[model samples]
Target: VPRGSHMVGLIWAQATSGVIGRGGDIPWRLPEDQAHFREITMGHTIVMGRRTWDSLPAKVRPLPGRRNVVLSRQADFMASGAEVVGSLEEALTSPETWVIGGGQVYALALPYATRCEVTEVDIGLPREAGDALAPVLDETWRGETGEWRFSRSGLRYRLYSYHRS
Candidate 1:
């Protein structure tokens, strides 16, 4: 579906190696990025593929204070606090749906998105992380930096907001 009045958001954090995850979990710890994610998505409906929802900490499975929607193929697939759907269109029902993804889901959702919040985590990966690659974003949208942040663990990251006109 085409974007409506409210923006469709693609949100994620990736390494310099394009690694968004390793072994189904986020490979880095970026507190500000985490917080920024929560702050932006709160009270809005969030959509993800089954694996992305599964990768979330069990402690916050429902993603608290928002509607959780997941795309899954299995009929018996169930997320504790999410509405499972067979297609992306089912999850894209909200006026402001945020597609918080793994690679495939991100790729599918981009055509319908008008805004994006990306965190460019600057850690060089020396090797392949199984299922680490995020969907490659193109120049269809323009973005600005969220400033460089140094984590207490000495990790470095910066957020970038992208808009499509």
Candidate 2:
């Protein structure tokens, strides 16, 4: 059910306990994962919520070389250099869109996700430790996990590619 051959993909980096954000920012910094995120999203349309849009760095917002779409319910919400939509359904109209998020956006798009690319950071923080969490994938999805790799920042992480099976 994606438009044409367009696939709805969700991408995120999460801690072992599913923590994706804390205090309005990512809890860890891993260049490898950053590079990976760029590689995966470059040349694709990235759809995110208003909070996620705000969470992006000031200089890096409307992430260069990709179509940026922000989802917001506020009638006055405006994100310069990015398309704004009120719902996930409206955002999915584009071809090859990836949901790059904060919690609520990810949760809203999960049911329609055709693919999920997740970087699992090897930190054992409790779920409650973070204010944002990754969406829980159910049994309908299957994941192909990569080997653990250590980063220069002293963290271990693995990437998982999940598909609706």
Candidate 3:
């Protein structure tokens, strides 16, 4: 169901105010969007940085139903249930890789990401609220914005797909 010129794509959730994460975790919770994440990533090879890997719940550490690859510069770093690669390029050796990230990893992969799937979290946050920001999609990307869907938490959000244009 996914195809792109580059072998990898990036998936992330960001607030309307552009905040993607804070204090080592995402600033908001949306179960339905979480389901969206699972749906998009299932059966694919997913890559993330060590910090992103550490942010996962212990039980879901490997993010079941996908090939998990963690990127870490630490030569001795080891991630259980996932392969450790020193760089994004190394992770790209696997086909159909998705860059499911934290800020740094997303920056590393952005230049090569021909496709992006973003969950637009509909909430406003202070600029200082989050340390991590979503990738700034410039003129190089053309997005198809989906309709806003409500979450039980009363927050509304939409999924968006972008490709290099």
Using lDDT as the measure, the top candidate is 2
Q: What C-alpha lDDT values do all the predictions have?
A: 0.84, 0.89, 0.86
User: RMSD to the native, candidate 2?
Assistant: 2.2
Report the Cα lDDT for candidate 2: 0.89
The TM-score between candidate 2 and the true structure equals 0.94
Candidate 1 — which residues are off by over 4 angstroms?
1-6, 126-129
lDDT of 1 by residue, 6-45 (tens): 6688898889878887888887788878898999899999
Instruction: State the TM-score for model 3.
Output: 0.92
Error of 3 at 90 (Å): 1.2
Name the weakest run of 10 consecutive residues (lDDT summed) in model 2.
Answer: 1-10
Worst 10 residues of 1 by lDDT: 126-135
Candidates arranged by lDDT, highest first: 2, 3, 1
Clashes of each: 0, 0, 0
Better of 1 and 3 by lDDT: 3
- CA displacement after TM-score superposition, residue 117 of candidate 2 (Å): 0.2
Clashing pairs in 2: none
Q: Candidate 1: TM-score? A: 0.91
- Tens digit of per-residue lDDT, candidate 2, span 1-165: 644687899999999889999888898899999899999999999999899999887788789889999999897887889988888777887678899998999999988889999999999978775489999888888979999998997899999999984
